[PDB]
Amino acid sequence: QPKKX
Amino acid sequence: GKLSLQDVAELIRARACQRVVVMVGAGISTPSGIPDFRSPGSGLYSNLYDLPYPEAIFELPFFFHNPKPFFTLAKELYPGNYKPNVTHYFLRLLHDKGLLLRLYTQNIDGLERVSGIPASKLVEAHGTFASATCTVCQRPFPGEDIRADVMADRVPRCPVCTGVVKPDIVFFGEPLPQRFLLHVVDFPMADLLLILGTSLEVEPFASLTEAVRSSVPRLLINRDLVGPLAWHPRSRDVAQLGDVVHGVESLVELLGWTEEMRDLVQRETGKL
Ligand SMILES: C=CCc1ccc(O)c(-c2ccc(O)c(CC=C)c2)c1
Numbered sequence: 001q002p003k004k005x
Numbered sequence: 006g007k008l009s010l011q012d013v014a015e016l017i018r019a020r021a022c023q024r025v026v027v028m029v030g031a032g033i034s035t036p037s038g039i040p041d042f043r044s045p046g047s048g049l050y051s052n053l054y055d056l057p058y059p060e061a062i063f064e065l066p067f068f069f070h071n072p073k074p075f076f077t078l079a080k081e082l083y084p085g086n087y088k089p090n091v092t093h094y095f096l097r098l099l100h101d102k103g104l105l106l107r108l109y110t111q112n113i114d115g116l117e118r119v120s121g122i123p124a125s126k127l128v129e130a131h132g133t134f135a136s137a138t139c140t141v142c143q144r145p146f147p148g149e150d151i152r153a154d155v156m157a158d159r160v161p162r163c164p165v166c167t168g169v170v171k172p173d174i175v176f177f178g179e180p181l182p183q184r185f186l187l188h189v190v191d192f193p194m195a196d197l198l199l200i201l202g203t204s205l206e207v208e209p210f211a212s213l214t215e216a217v218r219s220s221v222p223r224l225l226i227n228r229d230l231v232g233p234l235a236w237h238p239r240s241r242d243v244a245q246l247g248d249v250v251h252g253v254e255s256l257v258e259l260l261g262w263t264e265e266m267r268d269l270v271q272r273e274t275g276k277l
């Protein structure tokens with residue numbers, strides 16, 4: 001899942 | 006030839022735009038008195054144990070070493086400390102009128118929820134104080150269960166494993182919430198993008214302004230013009246620059262919603 005930042 | 010704020014108001018009022026996606030940030034929190042913790046010159050980094058740099062407050066490695074700085078902010082932001090403002094109630098009216106496809110928030114103050122917008126319409130991209138998770142055994146907790154600890158400046162400990170119980174705020178390097186990825190269906194479906202009170206500096210959230218279709222208006226209500234919109238402007242962009250509350254108030258006026266706003270706010274105040 002895509003990361004903060 | 007550019008669209009005006011009034012043009013966009015008329016599209017909304019006519020339901021020509023009726024699938025509105027909204028992106029919000031700290032500019033809608035500060036009118037409620039929320040600390041401007043995204044600003045390194047916030048008086049917060051005057052309070053703050055010994056913090057090496059502001060971003061450490063949302064870094065897991067730092068948190069495990071010293072979670073007191075984060076919990077100071079948690080105490081500050083915990084449910085009940087702050088009330089939604091007219092910007093939030095504007096968004097709640099958009100929902101009530103059947104115009105809100107989704108509201109994406111970078112804020113962690115929970116004011117969108119408290120305004121009464123149902124969870125189905127919200128993407129809390131940076132998590133929530135409504136719930137917490139033990140950092141060791143992964144046990145979930147309602148936020149009320151650690152409230153007394155947080156308000157007493159105690160680090161909440163898990164009753165199972167004594168791990169620290171961490172509010173469900175997304176820290177740097179953690180997966181964004183599952184619901185973030187709704188952007189892949191919501192932005193292409195939007196018929197209007199509203200960008201309210203965000204500098205569009207926190208990635209990857211800021212890059213979603215490009216994910217609406219090329220023909221869809223993008224309305225920015227913000228003190229300043231933000232790079233993502235400005236770097237790559239589109240023909241139906243509109244910028245209402247100035248204080249975010251005065252901008253929303255102007256839009257509410259053009260929409261003809263002043264009375265409905267008053268009714269809503271009057272109805273909701275008791276609850277808080
Ligand atoms: C009397 C003091 C009030 C005062 C004056 C200027 C500020 O920046 C802040 C402030 C804003 C955001 C923050 O996050 C914090 C930190 C918490 C104390 C302070 C407050």
Ligand SMILES: [Zn+2]
Nearest residue numbers: 139142163166
């Ligand atoms: Zn535990």
